[PDB]
Amino acid sequence: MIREERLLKVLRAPHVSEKASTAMEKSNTIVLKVAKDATKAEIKAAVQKLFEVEVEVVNTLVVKGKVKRHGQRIGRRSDWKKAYVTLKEGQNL
Amino acid sequence: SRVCQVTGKRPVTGNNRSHALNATKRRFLPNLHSHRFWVESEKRFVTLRVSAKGMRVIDKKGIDTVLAELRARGEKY
Amino acid sequence: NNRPVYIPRPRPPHPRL
Amino acid sequence: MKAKELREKSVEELNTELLNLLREQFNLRMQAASGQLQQSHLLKQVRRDVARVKTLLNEKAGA
Amino acid sequence: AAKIRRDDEVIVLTGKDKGKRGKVKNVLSSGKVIVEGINLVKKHQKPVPALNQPGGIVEKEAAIQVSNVAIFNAATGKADRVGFRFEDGKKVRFFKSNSETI
Amino acid sequence: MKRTFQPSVLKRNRSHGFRARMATKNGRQVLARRRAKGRARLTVSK
RNA sequence: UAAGGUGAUAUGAACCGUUAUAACCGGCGAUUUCCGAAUGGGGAAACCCAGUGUGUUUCGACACACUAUCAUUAACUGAAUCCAUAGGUUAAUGAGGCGAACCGGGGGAACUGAAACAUCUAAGUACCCCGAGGAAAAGAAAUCAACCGAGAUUCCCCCAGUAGCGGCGAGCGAACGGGGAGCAGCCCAGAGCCUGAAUCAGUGUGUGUGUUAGUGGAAGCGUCUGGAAAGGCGCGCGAUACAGGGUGACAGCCCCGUACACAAAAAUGCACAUGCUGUGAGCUCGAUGAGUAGGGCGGGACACGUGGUAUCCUGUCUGAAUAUGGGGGGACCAUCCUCCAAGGCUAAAUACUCCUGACUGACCGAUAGUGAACCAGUACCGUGAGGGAAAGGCGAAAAGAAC
RNA sequence: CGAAGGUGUGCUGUGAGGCAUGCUGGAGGUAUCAGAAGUGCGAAUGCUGACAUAAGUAACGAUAAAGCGGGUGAAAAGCCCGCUCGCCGGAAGACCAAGGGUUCCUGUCCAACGUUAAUCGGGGCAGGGUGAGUCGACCCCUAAGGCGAGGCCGAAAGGCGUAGUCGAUGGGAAACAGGUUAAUAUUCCUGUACUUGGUGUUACUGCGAAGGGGGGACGGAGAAGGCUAUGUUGGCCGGGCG
RNA sequence: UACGGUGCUGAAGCAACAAAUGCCCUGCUUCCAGGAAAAGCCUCUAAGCAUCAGGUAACAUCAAAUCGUACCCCAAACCG
């Protein structure tokens, strides 16, 4: 079985921003970066195991990369996916 | 395709000299005809696309021999 | 520094006939 | 360390592969993202270790 | 198979400071070595608001070509070429002109 | 003034897309010529 | 191999290693997402959606594998009618696509030349299509010659702009023979006697050598000018190493190298020896390629355009002899000479260079040389096929100008 | 103790030229006698780059229109705030598809870009921003049409086409109101709902298709009736009497 | 009030009239030019299965994935 290490790989990092802080303090939701595919079921399962918390629902979105102008060369940032994980009344982190 | 299934005759291109020797590209077609040959080995009729010359060689040589040669060539009748 | 690509058709001349 | 686990059985070597991913791999990535990971060479070391363990599993298991 | 190594007593053969002895600090992959106390360069260090604010003029060491220095013999008081020889299966360096092991 | 070029992603792909080119041999030859010339954009696509 | 390393633009941060499991290089393995012949189905390429069979914490839901088409073979099934066949299912093997030229075959121009233009030339060229290899094709005389003789094919130099063909215009243009490169001849259409009987092909072992990492590799100092000498001056040294490159101006003796002598655990090419498997000597007798040769009509190839036109090939219609027989010897006939078609295989001499290594240049030196010396077939232009640039240089060293 | 090149001067040859030297330049150059040529440019409406001319001339892109105070700033006719004036108002307003692809919002910068200035911007740099069982796509079905197992036909390539499989511009299940962010919401929050499937339980029962039927399922024009969106007025509530 | 805004509170919330190109209306009445297809859906059976499976009703539970979602969109952002 490889569901285990898959859950250890779908999370990538947490997202920090004033919207992220506002969501956490008001709606008790934490926004974090996830893998490219990172289906909602996998994100929910990963949050359950790693953070030993309970989640109401997970809704994701895909953030398109920006086109940046470095020197005399053009380049595009890599796309990534962020998920708004919603916790129940009881939360830890 | 206009290809004899026995002798392998195929259309061949060629010129048609006129009275003033003028040349135009033509094409000689084989005298193919769809014929139904009776074979006693299978006790049935087999339809083939053959030319006038092809029907003569079938008439002379055994029908079975032509079929056996045709099978060896790998063409499906 | 591209040389002019589209040159318009010249204006029709006055008929000297 | 490369031959230290070469003489390990599948079960125990599979376990340490599990531990390498669960601890020191997920936790390190969170620290690096949050910015409290002063030393980054751990991420390189752990990733190579996971690869080294993983190849032995394939080399041992099956062929 | 490099004649000049991390810790070597070398003497400059050419340049503005030919003849002065020194110890090699490090060797660059581009065939250049850094020896302290000879190739002083006055670098105008731009100030930075980071943790380090040295500013002013710094006296750094500028790398020099490997061929511009030779290992000091330390016995004949002159520069000498160095070669490689195999002894008990271990490759070692040795001088010339009454060659002796390092 | 309706100019000649009226962009449409669907029509563009179905006329000069990769799958359209590979369907017929001549388009396959076109891809071969592009590859030989080493063009970065082999065809038109998002 | 190793005391230095963590690719570059490109400093840093945080670390590894220094006598060996840092890094680097080579051999053999593992990993190898999605698109793409794409092959589970579909599709606007890098996307969407399934079936089946194997294994699994909350039924939840996951993981792995398989599932295209065609060709050949086998098995299992199975219509119109008993049998049968077509057909259907399963399994095994192979094929598929890409690639610069060279090679063979199937098609095949026009411009142009003729001072016009139609036969002709351009030209079996460009181009399109198919197939195969490292070369391919061709090929062991139904050939030439001359009644003297030569003995497969291919390629080069002559014969030779000769003989010939030709609105006898423009143009096309051999052969015989001579000199070289390289050499090789065999099998089936069949029975008996003798039976691994040679030569080969597919795989082991051993030997030799090559390839994929490498190692050692000689010999110079003092003074003058100068920012710095490799230069000037003086006296030495090595050389089976003054081929090259770098080094603060031009180095045989400062460095990397070169001459030269050595090295391969492993994986492989070639040349031999020695085993296994498969096909197969030799002798006797016999046979010795039929809708073929040839012919009529229409075309093509032959230098040879139907001309007196031999020879080969073909669309069409006909049609022998078979060795006391047949074909050719440039209309044709006779006499002579020569060969034995209608079944196949065959190395070398030759052609080409997408790619790798080494070396060379009375070749270019940034408007040149590849379109591109700088991440160029890029930016940019076009719906698309397609077109397609400009742009090299600080210094020995950033010491890239603190204040 | 200074090559080629560059820039002057002085000599010399009948000419193309040659020689010497000052300054710049910074490391290559080359006698003589021979050999080989991409061997000499002023023109080709020549090619490429650079720079003049017209010339500080035309123009500065709808004749809807601006004025003043204050603010920031080195600098304000153009930016921000306020008070006035003017223009659109079946649009020059408000929402979508197509097509763009970060132009969105915040901080910061004014070289280039904006036909002027610029503190401003759809400009440069950094960060942030797109939340769905119900919206759309995907998905189920099909039109025109495409492809097309076998098959038929064709020198080859390939053409046509059956079973099939694709193809929305059509058909098919389900959400509204209010609030919130500098930037998203019918997606987030609150309130109240709805639809399609899987599993389990209970009570009954015959179920069962690429098969049959029904339904889905449809034109133009015209008229009347019943309603709503919406508007006006009155009442009511709050404020005002200048 | 970082002077942009934030927080708190919150009365009345009815009637009449007019009225659509919108809804009833895939309607109705007429005319010739006679006005898609298939599936979801409803219903009847074949093969086969009927102590089953399956279906119906009620309750409980679970699932509803994946992609688009900014902004312009009669325009300074699309085609010129």
mmCIF file with all atom_site columns, C-alpha atoms (C1' of nucleotides) in Angstrom, chain I:
data_model
loop_
_atom_site.group_PDB
_atom_site.id
_atom_site.type_symbol
_atom_site.label_atom_id
_atom_site.label_alt_id
_atom_site.label_comp_id
_atom_site.label_asym_id
_atom_site.label_entity_id
_atom_site.label_seq_id
_atom_site.pdbx_PDB_ins_code
_atom_site.Cartn_x
_atom_site.Cartn_y
_atom_site.Cartn_z
_atom_site.occupancy
_atom_site.B_iso_or_equiv
_atom_site.pdbx_formal_charge
_atom_site.auth_seq_id
_atom_site.auth_comp_id
_atom_site.auth_asym_id
_atom_site.auth_atom_id
_atom_site.pdbx_PDB_model_num
ATOM 1  C "C1'" . U I 1 1  ? -11.596 58.345  13.733  1.00 0.00 ? 1  U I "C1'" 1
ATOM 2  C "C1'" . A I 1 2  ? -4.322  55.868  12.021  1.00 0.00 ? 2  A I "C1'" 1
ATOM 3  C "C1'" . C I 1 3  ? -9.586  61.487  10.350  1.00 0.00 ? 3  C I "C1'" 1
ATOM 4  C "C1'" . G I 1 4  ? -10.252 56.639  4.624   1.00 0.00 ? 4  G I "C1'" 1
ATOM 5  C "C1'" . G I 1 5  ? -14.099 54.726  8.020   1.00 0.00 ? 5  G I "C1'" 1
ATOM 6  C "C1'" . U I 1 6  ? -15.412 51.670  12.261  1.00 0.00 ? 6  U I "C1'" 1
ATOM 7  C "C1'" . G I 1 7  ? -18.927 50.141  16.175  1.00 0.00 ? 7  G I "C1'" 1
ATOM 8  C "C1'" . C I 1 8  ? -23.830 50.645  18.415  1.00 0.00 ? 8  C I "C1'" 1
ATOM 9  C "C1'" . U I 1 9  ? -29.039 51.454  17.762  1.00 0.00 ? 9  U I "C1'" 1
ATOM 10 C "C1'" . G I 1 10 ? -33.061 51.215  14.384  1.00 0.00 ? 10 G I "C1'" 1
ATOM 11 C "C1'" . A I 1 11 ? -39.642 53.714  13.385  1.00 0.00 ? 11 A I "C1'" 1
ATOM 12 C "C1'" . A I 1 12 ? -43.066 52.760  9.124   1.00 0.00 ? 12 A I "C1'" 1
ATOM 13 C "C1'" . G I 1 13 ? -42.530 48.639  5.797   1.00 0.00 ? 13 G I "C1'" 1
ATOM 14 C "C1'" . C I 1 14 ? -49.644 49.299  3.569   1.00 0.00 ? 14 C I "C1'" 1
ATOM 15 C "C1'" . A I 1 15 ? -53.552 50.418  -0.235  1.00 0.00 ? 15 A I "C1'" 1
ATOM 16 C "C1'" . A I 1 16 ? -55.086 52.048  -5.028  1.00 0.00 ? 16 A I "C1'" 1
ATOM 17 C "C1'" . C I 1 17 ? -54.122 52.875  -10.161 1.00 0.00 ? 17 C I "C1'" 1
ATOM 18 C "C1'" . A I 1 18 ? -51.272 52.188  -14.650 1.00 0.00 ? 18 A I "C1'" 1
ATOM 19 C "C1'" . A I 1 19 ? -48.594 48.447  -17.167 1.00 0.00 ? 19 A I "C1'" 1
ATOM 20 C "C1'" . A I 1 20 ? -45.058 45.404  -20.588 1.00 0.00 ? 20 A I "C1'" 1
ATOM 21 C "C1'" . U I 1 21 ? -41.457 43.271  -26.145 1.00 0.00 ? 21 U I "C1'" 1
ATOM 22 C "C1'" . G I 1 22 ? -41.573 39.313  -19.772 1.00 0.00 ? 22 G I "C1'" 1
ATOM 23 C "C1'" . C I 1 23 ? -44.955 34.682  -17.740 1.00 0.00 ? 23 C I "C1'" 1
ATOM 24 C "C1'" . C I 1 24 ? -49.580 31.508  -18.515 1.00 0.00 ? 24 C I "C1'" 1
ATOM 25 C "C1'" . C I 1 25 ? -48.136 30.157  -24.146 1.00 0.00 ? 25 C I "C1'" 1
ATOM 26 C "C1'" . U I 1 26 ? -43.785 23.602  -26.424 1.00 0.00 ? 26 U I "C1'" 1
ATOM 27 C "C1'" . G I 1 27 ? -51.081 27.504  -25.494 1.00 0.00 ? 27 G I "C1'" 1
ATOM 28 C "C1'" . C I 1 28 ? -55.067 29.270  -28.638 1.00 0.00 ? 28 C I "C1'" 1
ATOM 29 C "C1'" . U I 1 29 ? -57.014 30.873  -33.670 1.00 0.00 ? 29 U I "C1'" 1
ATOM 30 C "C1'" . U I 1 30 ? -55.427 30.839  -38.645 1.00 0.00 ? 30 U I "C1'" 1
ATOM 31 C "C1'" . C I 1 31 ? -51.997 30.126  -43.318 1.00 0.00 ? 31 C I "C1'" 1
ATOM 32 C "C1'" . C I 1 32 ? -49.050 27.061  -46.810 1.00 0.00 ? 32 C I "C1'" 1
ATOM 33 C "C1'" . A I 1 33 ? -43.939 26.932  -47.820 1.00 0.00 ? 33 A I "C1'" 1
ATOM 34 C "C1'" . G I 1 34 ? -46.150 21.611  -43.765 1.00 0.00 ? 34 G I "C1'" 1
ATOM 35 C "C1'" . G I 1 35 ? -42.208 23.179  -39.897 1.00 0.00 ? 35 G I "C1'" 1
ATOM 36 C "C1'" . A I 1 36 ? -34.514 18.140  -36.310 1.00 0.00 ? 36 A I "C1'" 1
ATOM 37 C "C1'" . A I 1 37 ? -32.420 13.677  -34.123 1.00 0.00 ? 37 A I "C1'" 1
ATOM 38 C "C1'" . A I 1 38 ? -31.135 10.688  -29.929 1.00 0.00 ? 38 A I "C1'" 1
ATOM 39 C "C1'" . A I 1 39 ? -30.793 9.940   -24.816 1.00 0.00 ? 39 A I "C1'" 1
ATOM 40 C "C1'" . G I 1 40 ? -32.387 10.783  -19.643 1.00 0.00 ? 40 G I "C1'" 1
ATOM 41 C "C1'" . C I 1 41 ? -37.675 9.581   -18.245 1.00 0.00 ? 41 C I "C1'" 1
ATOM 42 C "C1'" . C I 1 42 ? -42.411 6.289   -18.214 1.00 0.00 ? 42 C I "C1'" 1
ATOM 43 C "C1'" . U I 1 43 ? -44.270 1.473   -19.551 1.00 0.00 ? 43 U I "C1'" 1
ATOM 44 C "C1'" . C I 1 44 ? -44.474 -4.069  -21.650 1.00 0.00 ? 44 C I "C1'" 1
ATOM 45 C "C1'" . U I 1 45 ? -41.795 -8.428  -22.451 1.00 0.00 ? 45 U I "C1'" 1
ATOM 46 C "C1'" . A I 1 46 ? -37.563 -12.193 -24.519 1.00 0.00 ? 46 A I "C1'" 1
ATOM 47 C "C1'" . A I 1 47 ? -33.091 -15.053 -22.840 1.00 0.00 ? 47 A I "C1'" 1
ATOM 48 C "C1'" . G I 1 48 ? -32.044 -16.111 -17.833 1.00 0.00 ? 48 G I "C1'" 1
ATOM 49 C "C1'" . C I 1 49 ? -33.076 -16.091 -12.609 1.00 0.00 ? 49 C I "C1'" 1
ATOM 50 C "C1'" . A I 1 50 ? -37.547 -16.897 -9.057  1.00 0.00 ? 50 A I "C1'" 1
ATOM 51 C "C1'" . U I 1 51 ? -35.511 -20.380 -0.221  1.00 0.00 ? 51 U I "C1'" 1
ATOM 52 C "C1'" . C I 1 52 ? -31.945 -15.951 -4.632  1.00 0.00 ? 52 C I "C1'" 1
ATOM 53 C "C1'" . A I 1 53 ? -30.755 -11.787 -7.216  1.00 0.00 ? 53 A I "C1'" 1
ATOM 54 C "C1'" . G I 1 54 ? -33.510 -7.603  -8.435  1.00 0.00 ? 54 G I "C1'" 1
ATOM 55 C "C1'" . G I 1 55 ? -37.477 -3.970  -7.674  1.00 0.00 ? 55 G I "C1'" 1
ATOM 56 C "C1'" . U I 1 56 ? -40.867 -0.624  -4.627  1.00 0.00 ? 56 U I "C1'" 1
ATOM 57 C "C1'" . A I 1 57 ? -41.682 2.456   -0.022  1.00 0.00 ? 57 A I "C1'" 1
ATOM 58 C "C1'" . A I 1 58 ? -39.640 4.373   4.682   1.00 0.00 ? 58 A I "C1'" 1
ATOM 59 C "C1'" . C I 1 59 ? -35.423 5.457   7.819   1.00 0.00 ? 59 C I "C1'" 1
ATOM 60 C "C1'" . A I 1 60 ? -30.093 5.988   8.677   1.00 0.00 ? 60 A I "C1'" 1
ATOM 61 C "C1'" . U I 1 61 ? -25.347 6.916   6.749   1.00 0.00 ? 61 U I "C1'" 1
ATOM 62 C "C1'" . C I 1 62 ? -21.833 8.213   3.025   1.00 0.00 ? 62 C I "C1'" 1
ATOM 63 C "C1'" . A I 1 63 ? -20.372 10.295  -1.704  1.00 0.00 ? 63 A I "C1'" 1
ATOM 64 C "C1'" . A I 1 64 ? -21.013 14.235  -5.525  1.00 0.00 ? 64 A I "C1'" 1
ATOM 65 C "C1'" . A I 1 65 ? -14.502 13.926  -7.977  1.00 0.00 ? 65 A I "C1'" 1
ATOM 66 C "C1'" . U I 1 66 ? -11.686 16.870  -11.725 1.00 0.00 ? 66 U I "C1'" 1
ATOM 67 C "C1'" . C I 1 67 ? -11.051 21.789  -14.573 1.00 0.00 ? 67 C I "C1'" 1
ATOM 68 C "C1'" . G I 1 68 ? -12.802 27.272  -15.272 1.00 0.00 ? 68 G I "C1'" 1
ATOM 69 C "C1'" . U I 1 69 ? -13.846 31.234  -11.330 1.00 0.00 ? 69 U I "C1'" 1
ATOM 70 C "C1'" . A I 1 70 ? -9.004  37.666  -11.061 1.00 0.00 ? 70 A I "C1'" 1
ATOM 71 C "C1'" . C I 1 71 ? -9.765  41.736  -14.743 1.00 0.00 ? 71 C I "C1'" 1
ATOM 72 C "C1'" . C I 1 72 ? -11.303 43.913  -19.795 1.00 0.00 ? 72 C I "C1'" 1
ATOM 73 C "C1'" . C I 1 73 ? -15.400 42.389  -22.725 1.00 0.00 ? 73 C I "C1'" 1
ATOM 74 C "C1'" . C I 1 74 ? -19.206 48.265  -28.229 1.00 0.00 ? 74 C I "C1'" 1
ATOM 75 C "C1'" . A I 1 75 ? -13.024 48.692  -25.530 1.00 0.00 ? 75 A I "C1'" 1
ATOM 76 C "C1'" . A I 1 76 ? -6.699  52.076  -23.854 1.00 0.00 ? 76 A I "C1'" 1
ATOM 77 C "C1'" . A I 1 77 ? -7.037  45.006  -22.185 1.00 0.00 ? 77 A I "C1'" 1
ATOM 78 C "C1'" . C I 1 78 ? -10.486 41.521  -28.344 1.00 0.00 ? 78 C I "C1'" 1
ATOM 79 C "C1'" . C I 1 79 ? -9.780  42.162  -34.349 1.00 0.00 ? 79 C I "C1'" 1
ATOM 80 C "C1'" . G I 1 80 ? -7.377  46.687  -37.051 1.00 0.00 ? 80 G I "C1'" 1
#
